[PDB]
Design a protein around this ligand. Structure first.
Ligand SMILES: Cc1cn([C@H]2C[C@H](O)[C@@H](COP(=O)(O)OP(=O)(O)O[C@@H]3C[C@](C)(N)C(=O)[C@@H](C)O3)O2)c(=O)[nH]c1=O
Ligand SMILES: Nc1ncnc2c1ncn2[C@@H]1O[C@H](CSCC[C@H](N)C(=O)O)[C@@H](O)[C@H]1O
Ligand SMILES: [Zn+2]
Length: 405
């Protein structure tokens, strides 16, 4: 039985994805085939409605010098964060001498615009190789985890932050209480803590179970974020839905009664209550659809092999680990996975051990099918891969349902 990371309440499981490897550990073909596994399963707190995993992977197993994800590899995301940065420069960072702190700045995808504006800033990025890529752009970065203590250090030496921002980062952090204590110590009395992460509403609507893997500890909703804020002295004052990463919410927290919540907060809370998003029965129905997609996807891939049709994957996403290991998909069904990330090329995917090859290798003669694990990047990827589809190759998607197009 598992205690809620936010409130200490009881977490009831509704989905068990089985033994999983680390999502971003790509081994060389010669490397011995052991690896760390953990049980991936998800539950909902009874008190605060926080959806969360029931086993944590230690932070240092996930975030360290070989973290292979470099945010700046997507043009869509580069544009997304530039705009977010400009939006902040125009609103929250108009002070004299404003200060913005980003938790999980990675290769500096967001902070580059802040630095280029001459605004004082600090990235926390415990993963030293991406941290280094950010410093190369001139960005000020601390190779440390953000938590209560390092936030106190930063308050002490740099004074309060007008904005603390985290993208695709807070949901990676089981110790959200120490984070929030750090925000409390660091943030200006009139500041904002803004974070954006994959949205439970979108996961449930699209049955995108591949959004569940080791680094996604929390699947936030407005209902559970409002509860978490309230419980720590903050308040949810705005929400914005975002289409990136398969569907996200950007949550804006201010200290309690410092600002008036936008109409958008009540409206989303009401949609979720109306749709019974976080009712155990809804989440269990989602889990039932998860199994259906597994069963349909494997039936398709085995049918393809029996009809002599070649299948590869496209995008060696962290997400794809959950798919290949839960579904039992390896090299006998999907021969290679094509990917743009140098640190993942000439390696095997975790658990399933499918060879990863450079995307530049996905070329004539094309395979018959490409299983699109990077389905959140469909438009960006398919625009670069017109020749494949023109030649008659087809994509296999499993979100929101198994289908070919
Ligand atoms: C755009 C594009 C990507 N690709 C390849 C590159 C990447 O390996 C992967 C895409 O991964 P993408 O869906 O962005 O992140 P992943 O699920 O891994 O998830 C990661 C892990 C992390 C930090 N924990 C997180 O939360 C999100 C933000 O990112 O796909 C191409 O080959 N061609 C392309 O044109
Ligand atoms: N406690 C913590 N403080 C700051 N960053 C952290 C952290 N725990 C993990 N991270 C970093 O959080 C990042 C999650 S990946 C998301 C990166 C980027 N913000 C983007 O949206 O694409 C990784 O670079 C990881 O090393
Ligand atoms: Zn709780």
């Amino acid at each position: 039985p598992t205690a809620c990371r936010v409130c200490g309440g009881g977490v009831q499981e509704f989905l068990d994805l089985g033994r999983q490897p680390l999502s971003d550990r790509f081994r060389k073909p010669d490397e011995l085939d052991d690896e760390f596994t953990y049980r991936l399963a998800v539950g909902r707190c009874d008190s605060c409605e926080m959806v969360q995993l029931t086993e944590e992977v230690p932070r240092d197993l996930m975030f360290h010098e070989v973290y292979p994800y470099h945010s700046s590899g997507s043009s869509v995301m580069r544009e997304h964060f530039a705009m977010l940065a400009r939006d902040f420069l125009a609103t929250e960072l108009t002070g004299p001498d404003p200060f913005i702190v980003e938790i999980g700045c990675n290769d500096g995808i967001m902070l580059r615009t802040i630095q280029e504006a001459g605004v004082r800033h600090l990235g926390f990025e415990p993963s030293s190789g991406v941290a280094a890529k950010a410093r190369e752009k001139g960005i000020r970065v601390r190779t440390d985890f953000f938590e209560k203590a390092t936030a106190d250090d930063v308050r002490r030496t740099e004074g309060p932050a007008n904005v603390i921002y985290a993208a695709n980062t807070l949901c990676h952090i089981p110790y959200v209480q120490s984070v929030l204590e750090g925000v409390d110590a660091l943030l200006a009395p009139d500041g904002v803590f803004v974070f954006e992460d994959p949205y439970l509403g979108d996961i449930v609507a699209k049955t995108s179970f591949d959004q569940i893997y080791d680094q996604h500890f929390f699947l936030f909703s407005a209902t559970s974020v409002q509860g978490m804020a309230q419980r720590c002295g903050f308040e949810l004052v705005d929400v914005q839905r975002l289409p990136v990463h398969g569907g996200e919410v950007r949550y804006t927290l201010a200290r309690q009664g410092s600002r008036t919540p936008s109409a958008a907060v009540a409206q989303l809370l009401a949609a979720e209550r109306e749709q019974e998003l976080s009712d155990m029965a809804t989440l269990r129905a989602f889990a039932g659809n998860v199994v259906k997609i597994r069963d349909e996807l494997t039936a398709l891939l085995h049918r393809l092999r029996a009809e002599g049709r070649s299948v590869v994957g496209y995008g060696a996403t962290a997400k794809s680990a959950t798919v290949t290991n839960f579904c039992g998909i390896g090299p006998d069904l999907v021969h290679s996975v094509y990917d743009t990330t140098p640190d993942k090329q000439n390696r095997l995917t975790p658990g399933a051990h499918i060879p990863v090859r450079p995307a530049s290798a996905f070329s004539d003669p094309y395979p018959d099918y490409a299983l699109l694990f990077a389905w959140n990047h469909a438009e960006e990827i398919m625009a670069k891969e017109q020749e494949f589809h023109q030649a008659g190759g087809r994509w296999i998607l499993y979100v929101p349902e198994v289908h070919i197009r």
